[PDB]
């Protein structure tokens, strides 16, 4: 199995991990901050997804330094993962296009 496929495969795994970990850590970091809503795990996971995909609807978000730091890591991993998938696809199309040209 080529690397772009294997990497794309890994990116997925790590992303899911980042989501779970970021969910856990967001709660740990936000409880204790008056008025924070990112304090229960189920909605904390939803928040992590909507952040990683960059949808960010605005229903939930961190107010503390650490919550925002955790948030950045989720953002980055999310943009990179989906972005790496794009890389793999391009690589996939390139290879086959070369073949289609007899190369």
């Amino acid at each position, epitope marked *: 199995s080529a690397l772009h496929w294997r990497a794309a495969g890994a990116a997925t795994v790590l992303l899911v991990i980042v989501l779970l970990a970021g969910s*856990y850590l967001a*709660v740990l970091a936000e409880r*204790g901050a008056p008025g924070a*809503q990112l*304090i*229960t795990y*189920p909605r904390a996971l939803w928040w992590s997804v909507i952040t990683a995909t960059t949808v960010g609807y605005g229903d939930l978000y961190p107010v503390t330094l650490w919550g925002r730091c955790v948030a950045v890591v989720v953002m980055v991993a999310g943009i990179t993962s989906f972005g790496l998938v794009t890389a793999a696809l391009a690589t996939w199309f390139v290879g086959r296009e070369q073949e289609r040209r007899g190369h």
Partner: antibody
Amino acid sequence: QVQLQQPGAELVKPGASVKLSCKASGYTFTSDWIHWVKQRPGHGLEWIGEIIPSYGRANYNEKIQKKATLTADKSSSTAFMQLSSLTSEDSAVYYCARERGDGYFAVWGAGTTVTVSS
Amino acid sequence: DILLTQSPAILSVSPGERVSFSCRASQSIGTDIHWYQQRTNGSPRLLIKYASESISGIPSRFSGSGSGTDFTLSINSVESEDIANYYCQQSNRWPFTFGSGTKLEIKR
């Protein structure tokens, strides 16, 4: 079986401190939070604080005078609440509770009636 | 800090009659509300979670409803054993808070 075991009573002289416990049994998860609730005779329930055993962090009520200090023992599955420099004003029932990190108190301990007298 | 107002503080109802307790949050909180029943000398016990979700062990007689700011805990055909104090509790914003409570009195 009783998920949370709490001592029946604790007599404390004014100015002294006491350390309440809360033995936990049953299913346990890294996302569990143990809350403490004060209730004086004839009155409502007051949120005192909380702590997450898996990590060891605890938060407290900012609307009241901090008298408690929460700790946890992962090996013995026991949560402790240190109350210090108590006065009659601190005489009440202190309940411990378990929240699966989803916002509600699924189970409460029987409660420890603390009396502050000489 | 969300203020949960429970009024009236006491509710007199006749046997087998329907009753409804009220709990109003100072601000909107979706359906992040939990109801507890505490009998004389008894420890608090969860009745309804997230405004209307049932709980195992609890009688189908108990029901919940509402969203936003106004929540209601209902009981169809109240019987002697329902006598106790009732509290709502929010988990929408930190820190979690409790309503002052409503006592249920039965007029036999």
